[PDB]
Write a protein that binds this DNA or RNA. Sequence first.
RNA 1: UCCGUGAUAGUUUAAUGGUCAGAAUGGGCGCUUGUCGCGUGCCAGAUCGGGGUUCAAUUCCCCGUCGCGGAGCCA
RNA 2: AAAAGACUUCA
RNA 3: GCGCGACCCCAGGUCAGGCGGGACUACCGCUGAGUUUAAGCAUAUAAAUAAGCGGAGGAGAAGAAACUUACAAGGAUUCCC
RNA 4: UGAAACACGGACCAAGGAGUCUGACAUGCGUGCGAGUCGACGGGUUCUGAAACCUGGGAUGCGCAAGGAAGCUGACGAGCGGGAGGCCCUCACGGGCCGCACCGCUGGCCGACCCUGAUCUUCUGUGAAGGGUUCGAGUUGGAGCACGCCUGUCGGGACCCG
RNA 5: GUUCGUCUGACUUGGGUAUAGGGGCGAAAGACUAAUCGAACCAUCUAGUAGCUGGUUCCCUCCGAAGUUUCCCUCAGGAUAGCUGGAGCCCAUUACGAGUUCUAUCAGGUAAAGCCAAUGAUUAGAGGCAUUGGGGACGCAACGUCCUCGACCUAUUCUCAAACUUUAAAUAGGUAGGAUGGCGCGGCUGCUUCGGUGAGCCGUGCCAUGGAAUCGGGUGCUCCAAGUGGGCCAUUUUUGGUAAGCAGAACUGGCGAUGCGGGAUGAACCGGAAGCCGGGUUACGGUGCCCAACUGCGCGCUAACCUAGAACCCACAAAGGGU
RNA 6: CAACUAGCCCCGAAAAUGGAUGGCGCUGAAGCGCGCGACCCACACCCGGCCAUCUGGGCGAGUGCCAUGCCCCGAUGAGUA
RNA 7: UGAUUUCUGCCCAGUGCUCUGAAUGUCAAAGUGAAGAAAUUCAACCAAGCGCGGGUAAACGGCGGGAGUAACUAUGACUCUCUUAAGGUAGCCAAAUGCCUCGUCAUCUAAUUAGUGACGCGCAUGAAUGAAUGGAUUAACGAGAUUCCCACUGUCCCUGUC
RNA 8: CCGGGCGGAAGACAUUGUCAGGUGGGGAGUUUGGCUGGGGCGGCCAAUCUGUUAAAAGAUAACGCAGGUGUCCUAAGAUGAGCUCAACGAGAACAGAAAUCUCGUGUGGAACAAAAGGGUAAAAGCUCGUUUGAUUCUGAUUUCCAGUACGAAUACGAACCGUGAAAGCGUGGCCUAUCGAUCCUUUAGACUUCGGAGUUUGAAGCUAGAGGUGUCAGAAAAGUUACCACAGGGAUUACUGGCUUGUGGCAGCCAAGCGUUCAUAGCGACGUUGCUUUUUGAUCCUUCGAUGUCGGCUCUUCCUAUCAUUGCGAAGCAGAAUUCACCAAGUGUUGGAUUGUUCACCCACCAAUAGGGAACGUGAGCUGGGUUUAGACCGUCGUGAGACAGGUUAGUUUUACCCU
Lengths: 255, 105
Amino acid sequence: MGRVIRAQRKGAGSVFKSHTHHRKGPARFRSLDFGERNGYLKGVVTDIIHDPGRGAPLAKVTFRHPFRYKHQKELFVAAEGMYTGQFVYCGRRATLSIGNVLPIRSVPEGAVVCNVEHHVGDRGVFARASGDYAIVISHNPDNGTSRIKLPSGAKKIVPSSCRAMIGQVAGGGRTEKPMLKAGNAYHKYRVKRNCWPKVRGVAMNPVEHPHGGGNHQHIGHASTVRRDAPPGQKVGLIAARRTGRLRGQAAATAA
Amino acid sequence: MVNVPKTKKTYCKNKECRKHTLHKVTQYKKGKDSLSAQGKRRYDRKQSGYGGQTKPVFHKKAKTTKKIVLKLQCQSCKHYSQHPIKRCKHFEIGGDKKGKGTSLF
RNA sequence: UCCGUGAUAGUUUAAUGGUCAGAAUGGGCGCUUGUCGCGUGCCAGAUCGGGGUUCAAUUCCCCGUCGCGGAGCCA
RNA sequence: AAAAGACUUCA
RNA sequence: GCGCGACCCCAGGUCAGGCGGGACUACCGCUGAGUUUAAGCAUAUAAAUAAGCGGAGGAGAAGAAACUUACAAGGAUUCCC
RNA sequence: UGAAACACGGACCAAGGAGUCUGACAUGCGUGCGAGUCGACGGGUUCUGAAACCUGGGAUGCGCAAGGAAGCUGACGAGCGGGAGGCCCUCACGGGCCGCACCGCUGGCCGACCCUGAUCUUCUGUGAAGGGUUCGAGUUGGAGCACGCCUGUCGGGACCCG
RNA sequence: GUUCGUCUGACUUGGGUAUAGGGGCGAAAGACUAAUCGAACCAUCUAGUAGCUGGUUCCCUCCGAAGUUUCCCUCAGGAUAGCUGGAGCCCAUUACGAGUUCUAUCAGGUAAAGCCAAUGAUUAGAGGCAUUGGGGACGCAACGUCCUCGACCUAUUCUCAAACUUUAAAUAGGUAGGAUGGCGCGGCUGCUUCGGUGAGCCGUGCCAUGGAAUCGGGUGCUCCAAGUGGGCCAUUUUUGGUAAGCAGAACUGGCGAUGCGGGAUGAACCGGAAGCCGGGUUACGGUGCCCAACUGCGCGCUAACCUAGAACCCACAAAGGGU
RNA sequence: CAACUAGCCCCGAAAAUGGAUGGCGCUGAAGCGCGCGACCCACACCCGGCCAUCUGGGCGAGUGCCAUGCCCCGAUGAGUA
RNA sequence: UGAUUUCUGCCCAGUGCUCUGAAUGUCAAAGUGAAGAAAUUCAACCAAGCGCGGGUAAACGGCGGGAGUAACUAUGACUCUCUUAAGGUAGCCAAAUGCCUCGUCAUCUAAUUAGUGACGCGCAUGAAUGAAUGGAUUAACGAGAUUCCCACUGUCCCUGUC
RNA sequence: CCGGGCGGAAGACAUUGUCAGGUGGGGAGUUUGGCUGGGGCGGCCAAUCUGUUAAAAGAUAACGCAGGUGUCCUAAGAUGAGCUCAACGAGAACAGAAAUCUCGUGUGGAACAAAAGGGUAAAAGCUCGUUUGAUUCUGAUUUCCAGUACGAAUACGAACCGUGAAAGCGUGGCCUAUCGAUCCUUUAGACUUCGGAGUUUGAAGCUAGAGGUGUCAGAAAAGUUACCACAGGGAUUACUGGCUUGUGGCAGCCAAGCGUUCAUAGCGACGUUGCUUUUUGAUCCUUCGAUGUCGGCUCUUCCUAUCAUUGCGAAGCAGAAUUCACCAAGUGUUGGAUUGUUCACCCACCAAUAGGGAACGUGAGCUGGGUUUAGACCGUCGUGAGACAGGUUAGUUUUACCCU
């Protein structure tokens, strides 16, 4: 049989873990008291701080107002066109301007948003990677449901109470243009949780990996293995609908 | 193997006939269940579902050669006695006739 | 070479369960056609040599010739 | 409408 | 509200006192192999053993039958034959 | 197979150093007692781990044969041939008589198995009686048991070492 | 040591810190993880197992093997039988027994022979013979004729056979040659006889050296156990193979379990099995000297410059040539 | 004169560390074939002495006692496991 | 799989994989109903799985053979016929891949089984098993493999001396 | 202002627990014959049969010879009666070489399922008739042989049947091959037991059959290892040496021919006799608790079947090239190109560029290029791991001071 393979090593341990501590802080969205007809929770952009933990920025929005139980501060996700000293409004009756976060119901149909909540208060689930955005496809006067076409292309039923931020997320185009070094690739992966070089299954020994062994270079068997297959067995292209190079599409639900 | 008539006369062992009389050949086989058998032994000593001595499957215990597999069943007391060793393969029966030899057309 | 595997009409290759063998194409013959061709009707086997078994062998064995493949170490 | 192809030299 | 008693639930470097670890020969539980044997090896054997872990005493466990029996019935428990 | 071996080990020497011990077994041999035998779990007792004494036994045997239920229930009781030795006769050679050990053989009897099934009888029991190419570690005129030693045998680390 | 790769980055390197054994880590070599890595090291289970290698400890006596049969995941080993010893058990020249011969009588298909005996192979002719194998010539034709070539047929002829044999040896092999026998007498049976007819088995009587030869410094019998379970060689017989100091059988003797003497020398060949000695006498093989012993006698042969010759096995050797 | 028969010698007959009737050497042999005597000669054979073993005897009637002793026999004895 | 440039053809039969597919088949337990005094027995239902259908090769991989046919000749553009899942296309090739093989040849050297470029029916090449990189004397980078030239030198002729 | 349901989502769904089916090299444990001229590849000589080998009783082997066996049959069994065949000749509309019919002759030359070999004639064949013993019981006996099991065979008994006039014969096939433990199940026997007593289901027994192990006296089993490990082995390979000399090399005999003529100057068919180990196998004798592979580099000795040179004999030797034979290893027998290759093949010299051996001379003398480890690439084969008598590259050469 064989020695245990590299995926199972995730587990726990500092060696497989990243420096999550170095990362600059919470990405959280401050949970609305009530109201917010322009500036009842007023944020001031004072910096746009780079996050090393995803290599794209979150705008530092500083809410500062006192009381004692007032909860405030820290990083809302950056959108395009935001500037320092511009005010950010967070809540129900907020004005429709880019960078403001408000329930999706009050945002009109056909409107580009970044971040959505996959149930209220989970703070940002859909579209967070750069140059991506969801577009809210349908509403109607529907109390129950706001329908959003996601960047995956899926049409999703999600509650109308769920907050979204106007605009698209910033730092777009990031992945599109090529690294042009192995060394540039190393630096990005080092800062995030990934081990950098990919050794091929063929190059590994038969003990370590199913595809290993053989005098000449080859994968011995069919790459495609079942989804129902257990851990250890489940390798290669898992449950591929098709292979070889042509004519697919994005996730395409119908309603 | 061979067509051998379904109607033959043969001895009765039993003591109310105890002579040759007509008998109609038909096979009777059944099989087991009642739990009192091998199956109780299997239940106890499987011991995590390990099959053990239930497998003689590989190295063939399957060949196409049998012996006689006949019991000729009496129509005069219905008690009947088994016949001794002879060679078969299959065994032809159908309600017989003869398998009459000498063909003109 | 050892262990396998075939051969059947001019050519290329189907088939049988023991009594019995085909197709296609080529060719040979008319017809189509100004005239050939396409098309259209007609036609034609040592089932390798070889013995045996068997009522009866193209068919089921055995041998051999030829033509093939595939194996043959520590080399 | 699709079944319609060839066809020696001096000429 | 304050609810005498109290009800229910918290807190004392709280009043008088108590627990851990050891020993672990022997003992009482728990939990648990394989070599080996089968001239191979899995069922089985080793063994309900070794290893692992906890807990007492000078002994410990057991203990007055929801027993054994099929008899003019034996009669808690233990050990030996 | 063959070691001087161009097989293998061994510079030399001292001292260690390997078929043992046991439980349960077979044979042999010895000892006791003997249709019994075996004290020692135990108790009595003591000069004190002893020795002495003693109990009912229990174990094994004295009858078996079946898978089991069980078995008229195993007591009628045996011949023949070669037989040591003795006896008798004969001077002896031999003859006759009795014949053991032991061996071979032919029967009867018992159980299991199969037939046979009287008189009787709580109604299917009964088992006189006559048999059988079946079969038994039986009876047909038992021998064991205890102890010990060698050697064999098995479990044990098990001749020693890997 | 020299020579040399890199030397501002996927750089170098320390400390602190994380990941531990079917686990880690790996820019991946099964590499490395404290001189330790195709699963670390340590202790324990464990005094683990191993048909296999090594070693296995005082003496003398007497007897004394076998590598074979049968079964086996068995062919490096067990069971099994045999051989071998022990303990005996029973008689004792009575008795019967025998790797033996004779006699008398069976069985046998090898050597060989045979083929004009059957079967199979196979050579050569010769001579016949056709209502239908083929040609030609003579013919109108023929129930015509003649040549020709084939078949066949007949008497010959030639040579062979493990899987041919009528035939058919030798050496081998079996049985018998008596008291464990014969005969007389007279009993029983469900057998057998249409019948006491017969068969078998019982009691009783008669007949000895007497049933060819020879031997039994005795034999017969029972229990139990060790070792062996790889054999090897020579003469003879023999299968495969060009052959082989080869592989495999048949018979026997050896070696193994064998020195001594001989073959210069040699585990197996030759001679002979070996207590301890003196004296004698031999075997094998020798007698010129080595080397104990006739340079003895007798009668021949041999002159070898292209290898004089000189003791079975055995250390090689041929066709063919010589005035 | 020719063809043969078969003796020895010659040829055929050429290998490597130098070399082997074992050696020296041997020519009316010490060669080769053969005969005849004499002779030499194994742990063999014989005779005698002697050992143990085996076999058959024998001698205890006590009061010299090994009586499993002592004494007479004859044959036999290699010896691995 | 291995920079770029460029191009990545054919085949889902097989082994895998996939699915809003299968339509109720096969099909487990619990559960359900019937019989039997019951133990129990039988029936139907029975998911997932299986069977069935579709999709899938930058998944693994695979990617034919016989003949005939050009007016010297040979060869076959041409065409047949069988057969398969599909019949190797673009390319590269006696190549670190060619047994035969030192293939035939233009090649450098006197002489080259080594190197190059053709041909290549290629024993047994080939398209992310990744192929090629715009005639070429086809550049770059390498303690790489290979070959040839020039400088250089005791590597050698032929050795010597310190 | 009032409401102790923090506030949302989700909601008897998920979840969780326990059985149940599936899946599961991911991980576990384990296995992956023997005979065998090493062992693998291959084959079955693995359980069996026929004739022969097998050397005339018997026993009797080899991966000895020529083959065969996992079947076939309600008759191809059993029994009786009838009949006689293979073949050939001579005849007979059609009909020839073979049709069907007839007679003679006809020892078996046929037929009896099959492999082969026996045997057999008023049959065992062939044909007809009647049939079902191819039956029931349980021993003995013969083979294999431990004088065992098992199978199969023999002949009886005890039953009951069958056939035929009956006497008789019949326990499968004319004889020699054609088959199978305990377990477990299944079937039959109405018997026993289910143990506190019964009754009834069910179950378990005993006796005789069936379902079967072909490694066939009867484990439950697939690969790879050049990443390998360990116990042993020269019982055994690859390598040296030794025996052998088919295969290889060298040398003869005979002489039909060739050579203008003319067998033999020089050659020499068809054959045939030697020698050598300078080819390679065969073998397993010796060595695997250890004899360092191949080539080259270097250096020696020897061998002659002598290429040259010395000195000679032949000639189809006129001269001269050249060819043959003799004594002879005294003395020479070469450099390069390429390949690890010795060998090979060229260039070029030359009097000549002979051939062989010495542990396939030559590694504590070297080199380490080949072969032949661990890295790796490609192709092929393989599901894979891996393999490759296919290619390709890089890869540790230890110790003499002892004795001669």
